[PDB]
Amino acid sequence: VYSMEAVLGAHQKRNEILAASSNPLAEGVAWVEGELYPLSEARIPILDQGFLRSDLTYDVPAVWDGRFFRLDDHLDRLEASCEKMRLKMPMDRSAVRAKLVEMVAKSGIRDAYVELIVTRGLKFIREYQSYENNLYLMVMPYVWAMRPDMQVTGGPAVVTRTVRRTPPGAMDPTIKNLQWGDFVRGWLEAMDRGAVYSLLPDGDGNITEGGGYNVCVIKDGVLSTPSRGVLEGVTRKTVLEVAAAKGYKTVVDFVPVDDLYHADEIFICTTAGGVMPITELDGQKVGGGQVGPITREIWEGYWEAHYDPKYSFAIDYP
Amino acid sequence: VYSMEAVLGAHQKRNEILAASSNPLAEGVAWVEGELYPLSEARIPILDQGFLRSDLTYDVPAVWDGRFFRLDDHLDRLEASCEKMRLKMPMDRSAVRAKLVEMVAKSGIRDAYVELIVTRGLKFIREYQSYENNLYLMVMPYVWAMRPDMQVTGGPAVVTRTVRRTPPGAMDPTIKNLQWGDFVRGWLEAMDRGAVYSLLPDGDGNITEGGGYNVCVIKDGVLSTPSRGVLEGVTRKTVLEVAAAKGYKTVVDFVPVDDLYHADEIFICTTAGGVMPITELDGQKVGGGQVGPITREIWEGYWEAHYDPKYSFAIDYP
């Protein structure tokens, strides 16, 4: 009952119900300076340093089938990110958690992409010690980095050769951030070259991540994923737990670019889409060019976890 | 008459006139979707990818003493940046130029920092080919990266050791951009270590630039400035022209970090402040620890150029 057909099919039914809603928040809602707005109408001050300097961190939990998934792991990473950035979230954690549930519940959205953004505020970094930081919350329908119909077949990727990952000595990649100069270049290279997804090298022979997602490489029943140079994804975390539970070895360590070309399976993972199979790389088949059996087991176990009360709780909709 | 006293003194008189203005735009004005707003009231849509993904380029000409300085060089760089970003400025160049003059004239601001921002718009990079890009214009009182009283003495810098420059293979530094993850870390390191200005290495032994500015290093009458890894500043351009005119050699090429420690003089330069002497580095005097004679000649020639009709034109204020 956690097959692709079952999970994606039910989502599609929930989508058609949402499309028929007359709720003005059904297309999304934002929290700005204490008030709720329809997402298409929400506006932020142009002087905000999150805009003028991308001086911000953010995080993104999701709601699936009316259940929040690992919200507390996302709130922990956001608070760790803020500490690294010398930001202080302007709202208490319990109040943020309750606000998010209220926004989702009022929207009626059962499958939601939920974004929290903490910015430096209006003052330049030279005055960061007044900690006059700003907070924005957004709730919108679930975002698919790889659409359902493409997850059934897997998608095409390239290892980029015109762009590499911003190194950790320039920007710490364990801070989820919106400075996507490299990632945007990767989307453009993939489109130029006849693919969709881009996998960025680190400049010294190893693969890192892409614009929105971690990468997992499978070889002889061993799932390998980069340790350095990448966000420590919550999806990746779940994937490592699931793969272990099902009898596969997991390795978090350097993954040479050259290993991508000998893999049995490859997938990318992110809150915005889940487990996303990669079945073509640089124009060649990955493995058999179909969704591999280990990826499939992990995919199903990922979505099963969304109904586990250890990792999720249900929202009370009006 | 282009000494520091004369130039900064007159600016201070113009400042006190601006402070006394009852014009609601005297503190700045923004252009958003066809209308003008007081800068503190201007708001942009939260869904703009310039915010959600820092998917934008920008440029910053200045007005000094009621004269625009090298506006056409800044417009050329903005258009080159947009082409590299696959952005198309949504307004004709002549209309943008006229709008900027109108905004400055209505503000009454004689010394102005003028910012133009072109963003991807509301759609994700995957849909960049509809070119539905957005434009924002801002005019505000002149911004000083190094305040006047500190330019008289010069300021303190460090070569960062906890951060290095985002490399060109990750983000092209000739595109003026707002992805300041590395620069913000540099401001924090300098503050932690007992300085103000940060100079970022490239990771392979050479110096690049800092958060807002290029760096020029003087040794035995030779001005050296990095070619790779940095924005091609318009201030830097003017500095190279002035230094040549006055009988000094100029070199645009790799500048090893180690050369900083043997320099006779160092300054940083940017539209937001001009020519800004650095008289202490990593806790030690640069040269004699005072503004050097060559820096001083360049400083005066920089501001003299602001009255040259080859590089500047005067705004007709109401």
Cβ-nearest to B46 among A136, A165, A191: A136
Cα B196 from Cα B283, distance rounded (Å)? 11
Cα B156 from Cα B278, distance rounded (Å)? 6
The answer to whether residues A312 and A68 touch, using CB atoms and an 8 Å cutoff, is: yes
Residue B65 burial by Cβ neighbours in a 10 Å radius (0-12, 13-18, 19+): middle
**Distance from the B72 Cα atom to the nearest Cα atom in chain A, whole angstroms:** 23
Backbone angles phi, psi at B297, to 5 degrees: -60, -40
Structural domain contains residue A15: yes
**Distance from the A44 Cα atom to the nearest Cα atom in chain B, whole angstroms:** 5
Q: Which two tokens stand for residue B158?
A: 């460090």
Cα B172 from Cα B62, distance rounded (Å)? 24
Structural domain contains residue A78: yes
Q: Which residues of A touch B188 (CB under 8 A)?
A: 86, 125, 128
DSSP 8-state assignment for residue A122 = S
**Distance from the B292 Cα atom to the nearest Cα atom in chain A, whole angstroms:** 27
The answer to whether residues A292 and A313 touch, using CB atoms and an 8 Å cutoff, is: no
Cα B100 from Cα B115, distance rounded (Å)? 9
The answer to whether residues B247 and B239 touch, using CB atoms and an 8 Å cutoff, is: no
From first CA to last CA, the distance across chain B in angstroms is: 27
Same domain, A236 and A124: no
**Distance from the B124 Cα atom to the nearest Cα atom in chain A, whole angstroms:** 9
Residue B192 burial by Cβ neighbours in a 10 Å radius (0-12, 13-18, 19+): exposed
DSSP 8-state assignment for residue A306 = G
* Resolution in Å, one decimal place: 2.3
Same domain, A133 and A155: no
Same domain, B14 and B90: yes
Structural domain contains residue A49: yes
Contact A43 B39 (CB under 8 A): no
DSSP annotation string for A151-217: HHH-EEEEE-SS--PPPTTTS-TTS-----HHHHHHHHHHHHHT-SEEE-B-SSSBB-EETTEEEEE
* Last residue within a domain, chosen from A85, A110, A142: A142
Cα B82 from Cα B87, distance rounded (Å)? 5
- Provide the residue type at A191 as one letter: M
Same domain, A31 and A159: no
Structural domain contains residue B317: no
Same domain, A226 and A286: yes
* Last residue within a domain, chosen from B81, B113, B142: B142
- Tell how many helices (H) and how many strands (E) occur in chain A: 9, 18
Same domain, A104 and A208: no
**Three-state SS for A238?**
helix
Q: Which residues of B touch A181 (CB under 8 A)?
A: 54, 166, 170-171, 177, 179
Cα A205 from Cα A190, distance rounded (Å)? 19
Angle made by CA atoms B223, B228, B230, in degrees to the nearest 5: 85
Q: In the block, which residue shows the tokens 């990318």? A: A268
Residues facing B249 on adjacent strands: B222
Cβ neighbors of B66 (< 8 A, separation 6 or more) are: B110, B314, B315, B317
**Three-state SS for A62?**
strand
Cα A291 from Cα A310, distance rounded (Å)? 28
Structural domain contains residue A318: no
Counting every residue, how long is chain B? 318
Number of CB atoms found within 10 A of residue B20's CB: 8
Same domain, B119 and B251: no
Cα B254 from Cα B228, distance rounded (Å)? 7
Same domain, A294 and A152: yes
Cα A264 from Cα A288, distance rounded (Å)? 8
**Distance from the B188 Cα atom to the nearest Cα atom in chain A, whole angstroms:** 8
**Three-state SS for B312?**
strand
Cα B224 from Cα B231, distance rounded (Å)? 15
Q: Considering only CA atoms, which of A216, A313, A206, A218 is closest in space to residue A265? A: A218
**Three-state SS for B81?**
helix
How many beta-carbon pairs below 8 A join chains A and B?
Answer: 122
CA of B289: how far to CAs of A77, B8, B153, B159, B277, in Å? 45, 21, 8, 17, 10
Cα A309 from Cα A294, distance rounded (Å)? 25
- Provide the residue type at B271 as one letter: T
Structural domain contains residue B22: yes
CA atoms within 13 A on the CB side of A197: 28
Contact of A30 with chain B, judged by CB distance below 8 Å, is answered with yes
Contact of A147 with chain B, judged by CB distance below 8 Å, is answered with no
Cα B40 from Cα B26, distance rounded (Å)? 11
Cα A52 from Cα A64, distance rounded (Å)? 34
Cβ neighbors of B136 (< 8 A, separation 6 or more) are: A46, B30, B31, B32, B44, B50, B115, B116, B117, B119
The chain B residue lying nearest A47, using CA atoms, is B40
CATH of residue A37's domain is 3.30.470.10
Q: Considering only CA atoms, which of B179, B199, B89 is closest in space to residue B137? A: B89
The answer to whether residues A133 and A90 touch, using CB atoms and an 8 Å cutoff, is: yes
Contact of A136 with chain B, judged by CB distance below 8 Å, is answered with yes
- Secondary structure, 3-state, A71-85: HHHHHHHHHHHHHHH
- Provide the residue type at B318 as one letter: P
Cα B52 from Cα A141, distance rounded (Å)? 16
Cα B314 from Cα B224, distance rounded (Å)? 32
Cα A111 from Cα B238, distance rounded (Å)? 55
Strands B29-32 and A62-64: unpaired
DSSP alpha helix (H) spans, B32-92: 49-52, 71-85
Q: Which residues of B touch A211 (CB under 8 A)?
A: 125
Number of CB atoms found within 10 A of residue A313's CB: 12
Backbone angles phi, psi at A32, to 5 degrees: -135, 115
Strands (E), chain B: 29-32, 35-38, 43-45, 56-59, 62-64, 67-69, 112-119, 134-141, 155-159, 197-199, 209-210, 213-219, 222-225, 249-252, 265-270, 274-281, 284-285, 312-314
Number of domains present in the structure of chain A: 2
Same domain, A301 and A152: yes
Q: Which residues of A touch B86 (CB under 8 A)?
A: 188
Q: Is B216 left (phi over 0), alpha (psi -120 to 50) or beta?
A: beta
Q: Considering only CA atoms, which of B55, B114, B284 is closest in space to residue A182? A: B55
Cβ neighbors of B117 (< 8 A, separation 6 or more) are: B50, B56, B57, B58, B135, B136, B137, B138, B178
Cα B315 from Cα A312, distance rounded (Å)? 62
Residues facing A92 on adjacent strands: none
Contact B171 A185 (CB under 8 A): yes
Cα B311 from Cα B307, distance rounded (Å)? 8
Structural domain contains residue A315: no
Structure-determination technique: X-ray
* Last residue within a domain, chosen from A142, A157, A172: A142
CA atoms within 13 A on the CB side of A27: 9
Number of CB atoms found within 10 A of residue B124's CB: 17
**Distance from the A108 Cα atom to the nearest Cα atom in chain B, whole angstroms:** 20
DSSP 8-state assignment for residue A144 = -
Same domain, B118 and B174: no
Q: Which helix (H) or strand (E) holds A44?
A: strand A43-45
Cα A111 from Cα A126, distance rounded (Å)? 40
**Distance from the B126 Cα atom to the nearest Cα atom in chain A, whole angstroms:** 7
Contact of A87 with chain B, judged by CB distance below 8 Å, is answered with no
Cβ-nearest to A46 among B30, B170, B187: B30
Cβ-nearest to B164 among A50, A163, A169: A169
CA atoms within 13 A on the CB side of A24: 7
Contact A187 B47 (CB under 8 A): no
**Three-state SS for A301?**
helix
**Three-state SS for A120?**
coil
CATH of residue B234's domain is 3.20.10.10
**Three-state SS for A268?**
strand
CA of B123: how far to CAs of A25, B50, B79, B134, in Å? 20, 10, 21, 11
Cα A91 from Cα A111, distance rounded (Å)? 25
Contact A178 B52 (CB under 8 A): yes
What range defines the domain where residue B50 resides? 4-142
Cα B210 from Cα B187, distance rounded (Å)? 9
**Distance from the A136 Cα atom to the nearest Cα atom in chain B, whole angstroms:** 9
Same domain, B160 and B280: yes
Cα A28 from Cα A40, distance rounded (Å)? 8
CA of B304: how far to CAs of A41, B104, B269, B297, B309, in Å? 48, 22, 16, 11, 11
Q: Considering only CA atoms, which of B93, B76, B84, B71 is closest in space to residue B175? A: B84
Contact B166 A180 (CB under 8 A): no
Cα A2 from Cα B183, distance rounded (Å)? 46
Contact A163 B184 (CB under 8 A): no
Strands B29-32 and A284-285: unpaired
Q: Which two tokens stand for residue B304?
A: 């003299």
Cβ neighbors of B150 (< 8 A, separation 6 or more) are: none
Structural domain contains residue B46: yes
Cα B4 from Cα B296, distance rounded (Å)? 9
Same domain, B257 and B136: no
Mutation site for A-interface testing, chosen from B116, B124, B184, B188 by largest number of A Cβ within 10 Å: B184
The answer to whether residues B110 and B67 touch, using CB atoms and an 8 Å cutoff, is: no
Residues facing B314 on adjacent strands: B67
The answer to whether residues B275 and B235 touch, using CB atoms and an 8 Å cutoff, is: yes
Q: Which residues of B touch A45 (CB under 8 A)?
A: 40, 42-43
A 192-221 → B contacts, CB under 8 A: 203, 211
